[PDB]
Amino acid sequence: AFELPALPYAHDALASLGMSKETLEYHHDLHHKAYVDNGNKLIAGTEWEGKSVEEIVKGTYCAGAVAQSGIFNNASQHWNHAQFWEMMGPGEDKKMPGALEKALVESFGSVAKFKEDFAAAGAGQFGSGWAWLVKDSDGALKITKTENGVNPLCFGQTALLGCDVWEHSYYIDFRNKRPAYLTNFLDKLVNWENVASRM
Amino acid sequence: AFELPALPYAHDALASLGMSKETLEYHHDLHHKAYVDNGNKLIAGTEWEGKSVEEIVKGTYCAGAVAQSGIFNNASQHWNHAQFWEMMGPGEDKKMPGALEKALVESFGSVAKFKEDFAAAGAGQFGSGWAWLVKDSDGALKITKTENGVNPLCFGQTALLGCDVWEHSYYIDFRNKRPAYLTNFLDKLVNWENVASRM
Ligand SMILES: [Ca+2]
Ligand SMILES: [Ca+2]
Ligand SMILES: [Mn+2]
Ligand SMILES: [Mn+2]
């Protein structure tokens, strides 16, 4: 029983910050909805129907497969998009909590360096996927990238921040300019309080 | 070096058939150009600098890998896009040559069935990639699908038709409606004479 979560803001709340109303309508109301609906259809009457999204992602991931199952593809994307919406928010010059800032400075040298590494990872995922800031099982903060719906749950990592680099996430607003999208995302869209709360 | 081939028609020649001028400008002038340029930059001063695109694709493909090298990613996409532009063309109700029609009926039961299977493969490639009609090493025709830049050269197959299902190929004109794009492509855009010539 996957459900499409409401956005934590109006569909037009990110427009002045570089993610248009049109993008949120297509991305949330159609793409995320499809992962929920297709996920439910595929999961119905299987061993996975009882389970949490997290359990389904971890249980259906096939390590080393180029292509994952339909159940994985939809379950993982459902979870990813749910995090993504919460990781952004309205407001000019959103502030970074101390504990997060300190950890970023310690792991990357500076927030500016963190942001450059994150943007580089996003640009570097060839095809569809995600860039992430994760806390790994040693407690280290680091940048990762994944294909398609694959995500930090597949590696026993905790997602702190994710940025969708599937083309649908940015093509309306940035066309081919994935690097400008990533930069803008990090500078204007990220809700750092939500990021910090995942630590 | 790799060079960006000119389109075999004006940038606006497919607009009345459902692929806009804007799509061809971004897709050819920016995306394909990036594969050429990034390909060249990565190939410069390597073992591959002398070689044909085909040799580079076959030589750099890693069958045992989730992600391919930068050289592979760009070389394969350069080849794919070069084929793609020639596989489409202007004109309402473009002629399908007899030899191709016969071969499709022989392999798929009917042209309609071929088109359904091709569209299903395109819809079924989760994330970025390609749908193909190929002649395999037994000389039979079949439908395949591949991720990212992976293509029939990687499997000792001959590409007859490819349809780009990376989102940039359709998002301007169809947004999330990849199935409508595929249907339209098969109905209006394919230059069947170019397809037949590859047999
Ligand atoms: Ca809409
Ligand atoms: Ca017709
Ligand atoms: Mn998405
Ligand atoms: Mn393309």
From Swiss-Prot, chains A, B:
Keyword Iron: yes
Entry's cofactor comment: Binds 1 Fe cation per subunit.
Keyword check for ATP-binding: no
Requisite cofactors: Fe cation
One family name in Pfam for this protein: Sod_Fe_N
UniProt-listed Enzyme Commission number(s): 1.15.1.1
GO molecular function, one term: metal ion binding
Function: Destroys superoxide anion radicals which are normally produced within the cells and which are toxic to biological systems.
Similarity-based family: Belongs to the iron/manganese superoxide dismutase family.
Protein name: Superoxide dismutase [Fe]
